[PDB]
Amino acid sequence: MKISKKQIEYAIEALRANNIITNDNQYPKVFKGYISSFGAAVIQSGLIPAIIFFENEDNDANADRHKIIGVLKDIINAMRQQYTVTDATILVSSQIPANYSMAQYIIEHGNTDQLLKEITEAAVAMKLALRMYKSE
Amino acid sequence: MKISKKQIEYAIEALRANNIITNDNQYPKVFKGYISSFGAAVIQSGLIPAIIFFENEDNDANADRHKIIGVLKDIINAMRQQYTVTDATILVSSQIPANYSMAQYIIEHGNTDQLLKEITEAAVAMKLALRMYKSE
Amino acid sequence: MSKKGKSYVKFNMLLQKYILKNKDMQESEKFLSSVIQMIRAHAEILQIILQNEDKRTEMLKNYFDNNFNESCHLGYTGLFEDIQTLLCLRYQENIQDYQNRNEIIQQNTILTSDEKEILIVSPAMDAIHTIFTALQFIHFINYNKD
Amino acid sequence: MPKNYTLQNASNLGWLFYKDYYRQEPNVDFISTQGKESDTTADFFRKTNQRITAYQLNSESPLVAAFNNHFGTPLQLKTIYPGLITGSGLPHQTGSKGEFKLGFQFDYTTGLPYIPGSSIKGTLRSMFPFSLKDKGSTKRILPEYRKERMEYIRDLIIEVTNINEISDTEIQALEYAIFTNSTPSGKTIEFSLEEKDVFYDAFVADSKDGVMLSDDYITPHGENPLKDPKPILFLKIRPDVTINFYFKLCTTHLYKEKVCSSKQIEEIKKQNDFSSSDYKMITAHQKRNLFEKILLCIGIGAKTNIGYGQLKKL
Amino acid sequence: MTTRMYVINTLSNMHVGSGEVNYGVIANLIQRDSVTNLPNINSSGLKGAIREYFKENEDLVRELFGSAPRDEKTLPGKVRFFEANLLSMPVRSDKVPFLMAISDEVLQELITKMKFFNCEEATQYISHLSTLLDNIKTQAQGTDFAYVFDPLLQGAIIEEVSIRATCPSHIPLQPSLKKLLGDRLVILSHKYFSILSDDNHLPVLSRNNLENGQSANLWYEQVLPRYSRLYFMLMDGNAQSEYLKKFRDTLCTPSTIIQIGANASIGYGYCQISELSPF
Amino acid sequence: MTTRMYVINTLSNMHVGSGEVNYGVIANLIQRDSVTNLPNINSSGLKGAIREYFKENEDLVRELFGSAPRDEKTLPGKVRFFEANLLSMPVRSDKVPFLMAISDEVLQELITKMKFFNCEEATQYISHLSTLLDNIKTQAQGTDFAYVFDPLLQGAIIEEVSIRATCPSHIPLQPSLKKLLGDRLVILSHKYFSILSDDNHLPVLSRNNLENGQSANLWYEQVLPRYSRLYFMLMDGNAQSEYLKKFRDTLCTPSTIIQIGANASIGYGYCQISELSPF
């Protein structure tokens, strides 16, 4: 599991687009804990429980931790945008619709290993991209 | 391969400039592990993640681990200086700005293994040059 | 080597110290054969250390300690110290004998580059070569092929 | 099936807790905010919790018998109320009602609740003086920590063994021998295979007439007394559950405030400059008694400051 | 006589560190095979652990393993240790606490290894294992499968809900193959076994560092589940007869527990090594 | 009867030392070919290993390999041992545990060597390999190709170089070419094989020396993956036909296993040598 520089570029662009990393090139410090906790939750509980926990918006958290799910969605869409025609025969190279619940998407698409590897790689890339920058 | 004397000289200058070696020719004894681990991590995990890991400043590390990336930058700048300029040369010779961090520089200019080769030689030079000093 | 100095004396003492004496059979200070290859391979770094001013002794000690950092090298501290002392003495003798001679040879525009290069002696490199040759002589006398 | 865990008729407790817990049933809907609070979701999680908490363990279990055959004679202690929590930090949470919101440490292969040997080792080392690392941050609390723990350990050693005086350097050497198998300086002592102190994983051995797992509540009332508290439900090991503590301990020889090996100590004995004044011995039985006293004093697991994880003699 | 096959029964949670840096969730990962990408024990680790067990008998170690690295005169080792490859891995189910999981590709690899190396009891095992593999492939017909041989374990969930076990008759499992592979055995397709044994599905144990009762560090460690089975091949290289016999008896005796891997003091890598019994 | 071609099937990990002082992460690097930089076995090491296997038959060794280094009489060696070049290497996949990887340049060099040396069965192999190479180049047309010849293997991923395998259905792979190159064969572009065989992607193993449980040394070794295939040429220089027949029959016997390289005590460099069969 090697994180390519293109995945890290996707992570940086997604983190900027979802208003986690401001124009000052700083981020709220709680988001590194959010990303680490999501990484641990995926491997301990599972993809569905972790995404459900991190995707809800009625939480009593300091910051908008539901934005890491949007960052994941953007990274996965960017990765699927560069799937070759040969990949598209085995791999579902279809953009996640957006405005769609990510948990709903994963439930509807079975529980294929493809989504699990994609989300694991995207979470690691998000972690590294956040480590590229500075806490507020 | 042999030991490049010029690269060892660049390593000495960069170690002094980046404040790893004190005035009484000494270092905080964690930096030798830092350099060896940097080489191993570049081999095992890839250039970009290793650079991000060792360049991170919000770390619970014993000392200022991000100084080894500054030493790497100085060595690479020094060796890119005195690169011969012939129209048959594969090397860029463009100097890495002090404004730029190493990770963003490899992200936006990283399509060739020139940076990987230069970083490997710079890490080896750091390892061999640090043996000339004492550990506090 | 120049016999007008302490480098010759230290060279003789090093030879006498680390040469096995079969005629007796009580013991002599042991020899590390890996130092011979270290001198040859690390010659450029050693030259950098020698060309350093007023810190070369500490730098040489640090280099030899940090390269031979294992528990098996605790017995060869005497050999490392003798090598460092001899190398420093030879570098001092070589600079005092050759620096001005080389800088007048370099800008003597009557000789071609080939004869200038065959005439120009690098002090630190010559000291490294002398120590290397002495160590090789010690190993050659000591090593048998039983 | 529901009770008497066994190897022939059971579901893996760890599997039930982590992978099968949030199984997607035809009509459950805990994705939405409305469905997370619904009675259907609460009933679903109640049924899952009842399945998890319905298993008991017999004393004559082939699983625990195999543990005894492999790791040696267990040290048997009992859990008192409220119980035992381990692995509390493992992520098990979605935001639903009736759900277990704290992690639990389950053995992967067997599914039995267990305390990993690293937890036991750390809990035992915590009451030894030389467990806090000498760091810049910890420098201000290092001396008092060492003083308190050294007095405690000295009293425990005098109580357990027939040693009359033990010195601070002797306590340092003994702790480093037990937990690091090394000299306090970092050097190594040439030890035999049987001279290593090993801390195996503790296991649940007997539930007796009840189940070995139960559910418990912590209700954190906030700093604002006018706002509603949040109930948190978690999984605990029931009171009066036998815990088997497996160790592999050796005899530690101390001569002149340094730790000696067995051949070293026999050679020292045969020397004519040998005194019994500076020779000290603590055997495996005495080490086990000392560990037992530490465990009975501080307990093991999570939330031990508020009574969770306190143990009693069988 | 030359080549023998030994099976490593793991009594606790194995951790053999690869040492590579992982920047994801699990900081410390376990060693994997270069070719098959399955968990394995490098032969150097096996030799080191068994040398540590036998270190008290200096003559036996000197004859069989070689000279100590510090000795002035170096003696080559006579017995040859081959790397331990994964045979069976426990998988958690809803009908039973754990099943013994093996793949058809693992079975094929074992058959090929026995054919190439010619271990002592190889002929019968190869014949019956080839029969088993042929029956399994004939029944599978190129599809995904999870085959159980006890009819009571029908419909069992092999960890993931997508993998459910079917019991095909006409496929006999010999008692000796049950002894080699494990009780409550499930034969998995390569896709399923790769899914169950990859980095996201192998067991992880959480660990932290406490300073005066407050958490300082935190990391996750990948471990090989308890009661896993690994096989390795040992060739005696003109080693002395009675030293070899003592090695064989001590290694295979019931009371021998050998520590392989890391985290010995916290009980991780304790194993039992058994020899391939006659069919 | 002269100049026959032999294929080395590697049953374990292989490390043939380079003798190069690498100041870097990997201190122990494997032997690499001068022109192509692909991993190779020097002819001296191959001759030494084969001599060591046969050293029990003194007369065969003396007649074929020559006199011992200490013999008072010096007898020149009669057989000619050519160096062994990499033919196929296992790459990690997802549909299958591994694929056998060869480059078009490796095939071109094999054809060139067979033409230059006049191997025993060289003619048919040259014709069919030229047909296959021309077909591959016709299908690729200057693109970065990765072709598998079993339709079930379509879309198998090479994990190191994240590409997927296409199936050129109109290219035949003959059974003898399957035997020579290997089962589950993928033929890649030169750049893919170069990336897959470089220092960063060849397996690297971590090793340490433990003094009383404390780490004394640490180093990294790179190895040739197990099941790799290498080929070399053997010329029969006026050697006795009976000793030659004994040597060839013993070498190509299935039960013969030869150790080539370092780390013999652990399971490294154990190989099977087979002769080129008639097409």
- Please state the φ and ψ torsions of residue A113, each to the nearest 5 degrees: -60, -30
Q: How far is CA F81 from CA B69, F31, F78, F235, F236, in A?
A: 49, 17, 10, 7, 9
- Chain C neighbors (3+ CB pairs < 8 Å): B, F
Query: Which residue is listed with tokens 């000289």?
Result: B9
Q: Which two tokens stand for residue D194?
A: 């049987």
Task: Tell whether omega for the bond before F225 is within 30 degrees of 0, i.e. cis.
Answer: no
Residue B135 β-bridge partners: B27
* D302 to chain E, closest Cα gap in Å: 11
Deposited experimental method: cryo-EM
- E18 vs F206: CB contact, 8 Å cut-off? yes
Identify whether the C-beta of residue A9 lies closer than 8 Å to the C-beta of residue B106: no
Q: Which of B3, B5, B131 sits opposite C66 (nearest CB)?
A: B131
| Polymer length of chain D | 314
Give the separation between CA D264 and CA D213, rounded to whole angstroms. Answer: 49
- E213 vs D121: CB contact, 8 Å cut-off? no
Residue F204 β-bridge partners: F222
* D15 interfaces chain E, CB cutoff of 8 Å: yes
Question: If 0-12 CB within 10 Å is exposed, 13-18 middle and 19+ buried, where does residue C21 land?
Answer: exposed
A98's torsion region: left (phi>0), alpha (psi -120 to 50) or beta? left
Q: Which of B43, B127, B128 sits opposite F204 (nearest CB)?
A: B43
Query: Which residue is listed with tokens 């035997």?
Result: F179
| Polymer length of chain E | 279
* E118 contacts in chain F (CB < 8 Å): 255
Q: Which two tokens stand for residue C68?
A: 């031979």
Give the separation between CA B73 and CA B75, rounded to whole angstroms. Answer: 6
Query: E83-115 b/e with 16+ CB inside 10 Å = b?
Result: bbbbbbbbbbbbbbbbbbbbbbbbbbbbbebbe
* F94 interfaces chain E, CB cutoff of 8 Å: yes
CB atoms inside a 10 Å sphere around CB D180: 17
Strands annotated E in chain C: none
Q: Which residues have CB under 8 Å from A33's CB, separation 6+?
A: none
Report the candidate in E108, E80, E38 with the shortest Cα–Cα distance to residue E232.
Answer: E80
C-alpha triplet F244, F245, F247: angle, nearest 5°: 65
Give the separation between CA C60 and CA C80, rounded to whole angstroms. Answer: 10
Residue F98 β-bridge partners: F92
E239's torsion region: left (phi>0), alpha (psi -120 to 50) or beta? beta
Give the separation between CA F7 and CA F110, rounded to whole angstroms. Answer: 12
Instruction: List D residues 68-97 in contact with E (Cβ-Cβ < 8 A).
Output: 70-71, 87, 89-90
Question: If 0-12 CB within 10 Å is exposed, 13-18 middle and 19+ buried, where does residue B82 land?
Answer: exposed
Residue E233 β-bridge partners: E5
Give the separation between CA E188 and CA E173, rounded to whole angstroms. Answer: 15
Q: Which two tokens stand for residue A63?
A: 């910051």
Q: Which residue of E has its CA nearest to B53?
A: E23
Helix (H) or strand (E) holding B107: helix B102-108
Give the separation between CA D189 and CA D196, rounded to whole angstroms. Answer: 11
Half-sphere exposure of D307 (CA within 13 A, CB side): 7
Q: What torsion do the CA atoms of E225, E227, E229, E230 make, to the nearest 10 degrees? A: 60
What letter would DSSP give residue E201?
A: T
Helix (H) or strand (E) holding E127: helix E122-140
Q: Which of E52, E98, E211 sits opposite D133 (nearest CB)?
A: E211
Helix (H) or strand (E) holding B80: helix B67-80
Give the separation between CA D129 and CA E244, rounded to whole angstroms. Answer: 47
**3 state DSSP class of E40:** strand
Q: How far is CA E33 from the centre of its chain?
A: 12
- Please state the φ and ψ torsions of residue E50, each to the nearest 5 degrees: -70, -35
- Chain D neighbors (3+ CB pairs < 8 Å): A, E, F
Give the separation between CA B4 and CA D28, rounded to whole angstroms. Answer: 68
Q: Which two tokens stand for residue B73?
A: 């930058």
* E24 contacts in chain A (CB < 8 Å): 1, 39, 120, 123-124, 127
Question: If 0-12 CB within 10 Å is exposed, 13-18 middle and 19+ buried, where does residue D258 land?
Answer: middle
What letter would DSSP give residue D113?
A: B
- Please state the φ and ψ torsions of residue E216, each to the nearest 5 degrees: -105, -50
* A3 contacts in chain B (CB < 8 Å): 46, 48-49
Residue F236 β-bridge partners: F79
Q: Which of B44, B53, B60 sits opposite E20 (nearest CB)?
A: B44
> Please, do chains C and B touch (3+ CB pairs < 8 Å)?
yes
Q: How far is CA B131 from CA B11, C41, C58, C63, C66, in A?
A: 11, 15, 12, 5, 5
Q: How far is CA B10 from the centre of its chain?
A: 10
Strand order in the sheet with D258-260: D258-260, D252-255, D279-282
| Polymer length of chain C | 146
Query: Which residue is listed with tokens 């593999």?
Result: E133
Report the candidate in F204, F38, F156, F272 with the shortest Cα–Cα distance to residue E34.
Answer: F204
Sign of CA dihedral D146, D149, D153, D155: positive
Instruction: Kindly provide the resolution of this structure in angstroms, with one decimal.
Output: 2.9
* F207 to chain A, closest Cα gap in Å: 22
Q: How far is CA E159 from the centre of its chain?
A: 20
Query: Which residue is listed with tokens 């994990």?
Result: F159
Q: How far is CA F82 from CA C92, E103, F13, F242, F258, in A?
A: 53, 40, 22, 22, 17
Give the separation between CA D221 and CA B47, rounded to whole angstroms. Answer: 49
Report the candidate in B1, B38, B3, B44 with the shortest Cα–Cα distance to residue B132.
Answer: B3
- Please state the φ and ψ torsions of residue F88, each to the nearest 5 degrees: -135, 145
CB atoms inside a 10 Å sphere around CB C26: 5
Query: A6-24 b/e with 16+ CB inside 10 Å = b?
Result: ebbbbbbbbbbebebbeee
Q: Which amino acid is at E275?
A: E
Report the candidate in E231, E253, E259, E246 with the shortest Cα–Cα distance to residue E58.
Answer: E246
* E21 interfaces chain F, CB cutoff of 8 Å: no
Q: How far is CA A90 from CA A102, F93, F155, F165, in A?
A: 21, 14, 7, 12
Q: How far is CA D233 from CA B117, D96, D217, D303, E208, in A?
A: 55, 11, 5, 14, 23
- C71 vs F216: CB contact, 8 Å cut-off? yes
Q: How far apart are the first and last CA of chain F?
A: 17
> Please, do chains C and A touch (3+ CB pairs < 8 Å)?
no
Question: If 0-12 CB within 10 Å is exposed, 13-18 middle and 19+ buried, where does residue F184 land?
Answer: buried
CB atoms inside a 10 Å sphere around CB D208: 15
C-alpha triplet D7, D8, D9: angle, nearest 5°: 100
Query: A76-108 b/e with 16+ CB inside 10 Å = b?
Result: bbbbbeeeeebbeebbeeeebeeeebbbeebee
Q: Which two tokens stand for residue F172?
A: 């035949």
Q: Alpha helix (H) ranges present in D37-136?
A: 39-53, 62-71, 117-125
* E21 contacts in chain B (CB < 8 Å): 37, 40-41, 44-45, 50, 53
Q: How far is CA C4 from CA B65, C9, D53, in A?
A: 50, 9, 93
- D182 vs F214: CB contact, 8 Å cut-off? yes
- Chain F neighbors (3+ CB pairs < 8 Å): A, B, C, D, E
Give the separation between CA E259 and CA D209, rounded to whole angstroms. Answer: 37
Q: Which amino acid is at A11?
A: A
Give the separation between CA B125 and CA B35, rounded to whole angstroms. Answer: 10
- E94 vs D90: CB contact, 8 Å cut-off? no
Give the separation between CA F48 and CA F29, rounded to whole angstroms. Answer: 20
Query: Which residue is listed with tokens 């208003």?
Result: A19
Give the separation between CA D59 and CA D208, rounded to whole angstroms. Answer: 7
Identify whether the C-beta of residue A55 lies closer than 8 Å to the C-beta of residue A103: yes
Q: Which residues have CB under 8 Å from C73's CB, separation 6+?
A: C32, C80
Strands annotated E in F156-213: 157-158, 163-164, 185-188, 204-211
Q: Which two tokens stand for residue C12?
A: 């003789």
Q: Which residue of A has its CA nearest to B101?
A: A132
C-alpha triplet C122, C127, C132: angle, nearest 5°: 125
Q: Which residues have CB under 8 Å from F116's CB, separation 6+?
A: none
Q: Which two tokens stand for residue C76?
A: 């060869």
Give the separation between CA E21 and CA B37, rounded to whole angstroms. Answer: 9
Identify whether the C-beta of residue C82 lies closer than 8 Å to the C-beta of residue C14: yes
Give the separation between CA E62 and CA E59, rounded to whole angstroms. Answer: 5
Give the separation between CA A79 and CA C48, rounded to whole angstroms. Answer: 50
Q: How far is CA D86 from the centre of its chain?
A: 8
Instruction: List F residues 143-162 in contact with A (Cβ-Cβ < 8 A).
Output: 154-155, 162
Q: Pairing mode, if any, of strands F40-41 and E84-92?
A: unpaired
**3 state DSSP class of D174:** helix
Report the candidate in C126, C121, C138, C141 with the shortest Cα–Cα distance to residue C36.
Answer: C138
> Please, do chains B and A touch (3+ CB pairs < 8 Å)?
yes
CB atoms inside a 10 Å sphere around CB F200: 18
Identify whether the C-beta of residue D253 lies closer than 8 Å to the C-beta of residue D279: yes
Report the candidate in C106, C52, E223, E212 with the shortest Cα–Cα distance to residue D146.
Answer: E212
Instruction: List F residues 10-29 in contact with C (Cβ-Cβ < 8 A).
Output: 21
* F211 contacts in chain C (CB < 8 Å): 71
Q: Which amino acid is at E216?
A: A
Report the candidate in D48, D217, F218 with the shortest Cα–Cα distance to residue E44.
Answer: F218
Give the separation between CA D292 and CA D75, rounded to whole angstroms. Answer: 8
E19's torsion region: left (phi>0), alpha (psi -120 to 50) or beta? left
Q: Which residues have CB under 8 Å from F235's CB, separation 6+?
A: F2, F3, F79, F80, F82
Q: Pairing mode, if any, of strands E146-148 and E185-188?
A: antiparallel
Report the candidate in A117, A46, A29, A135 with the shortest Cα–Cα distance to residue A79.
Answer: A117
Q: Pairing mode, if any, of strands D279-282 and E3-10?
A: unpaired
Give the separation between CA C114 and CA C102, rounded to whole angstroms. Answer: 14
Query: Which residue is listed with tokens 């978690």?
Result: D234
Query: Which residue is listed with tokens 């016997």?
Result: F253
Q: How far is CA E80 from the centre of its chain?
A: 18
Long-range contacts of F211-215 (CB under 8 A, 24+ apart): F211/C71, F211/D188, F212/D188, F212/D189, F212/D190, F212/D191, F213/D181, F213/D188, F213/D191, F214/D182, F214/D188
Identify whether the C-beta of residue F269 lies closer than 8 Å to the C-beta of residue F262: yes
What letter would DSSP give residue F17?
A: B
Q: Pairing mode, if any, of strands F214-222 and F26-28?
A: parallel
* A32 contacts in chain B (CB < 8 Å): 58
CB atoms inside a 10 Å sphere around CB F192: 21
Long-range contacts of D66-73 (CB under 8 A, 24+ apart): D67/D203, D67/D244, D67/D246, D68/D244, D70/E11, D70/E257, D70/E270, D71/D200, D71/D246, D71/D248, D71/E11, D71/E267, D71/E270, D72/D246, D72/D247, D72/D248
Identify whether the C-beta of residue F205 lies closer than 8 Å to the C-beta of residue E20: no
* B52 contacts in chain A (CB < 8 Å): 8, 128, 131-132
Strands annotated E in chain D: 75-79, 114-115, 198-199, 202-206, 213-218, 232-237, 242-245, 247-248, 252-255, 258-260, 279-282, 311-313
Q: Which of C41, C70, C71 sits opposite F21 (nearest CB)?
A: C41
Report the candidate in D57, D56, D59 with the shortest Cα–Cα distance to residue D68.
Answer: D59
